[PDB]
Fold this protein.
Amino acid sequence: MEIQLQQSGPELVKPGASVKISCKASGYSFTDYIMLWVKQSHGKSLEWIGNINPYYGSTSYNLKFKGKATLTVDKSSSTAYMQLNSLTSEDSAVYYCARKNYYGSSLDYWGQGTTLTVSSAKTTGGGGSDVVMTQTPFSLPVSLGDQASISCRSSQSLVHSNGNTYLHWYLQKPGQSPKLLIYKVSNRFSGVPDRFSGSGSGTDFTLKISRVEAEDLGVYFCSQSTHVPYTFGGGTKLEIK
Amino acid sequence: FYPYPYA
């Protein structure tokens, strides 16, 4: 039945109001996978909001969203929810739900995204000990056919006690939700072509594309899930000259 | 055992 995460439609709300965004899962056993939520302010990187374990209803939040976002689940309908309260203009963004697996600790399936616009308009549509992910370059212009190489550095080793390194790469095509490309440093996710290859260790990682094709254009994000909270790199936009 | 992603 192939997995699908279907979110509710775009929202237009007044400042101060609340919104409850839904994420209906189908094609898998809802209570066997953590559901994670991500915020993406227009033109910015991805931000981890929090996770919910549908089996227990237990949650964990990014410190900055704790007290702002409330994650719930309805197991009968296999639906996860995120309510955001006291909305301001800074809450306007695209929010995603995404399934998180255990073997890779990666986000294998993403919802299509829900655009929230906080407005009076009638129509239209910190640091601490967190691991920091730095991507270089910010932007990589090429001619189609060129090879490409982009780097991702972590503020500390991503080697985990169990010996694995939970560093993944995602590709977000213009206007779409991110998609998993490589999980755990060098493993290609299902359907990802051989021209993509991940390498590196510890705090130094690289993604290579031996030959850039049109379908490869977009923004590449690295992320780490070896340490909590989960963190994302700032993004590298791959575009044509 | 559920549903687990990491720690």
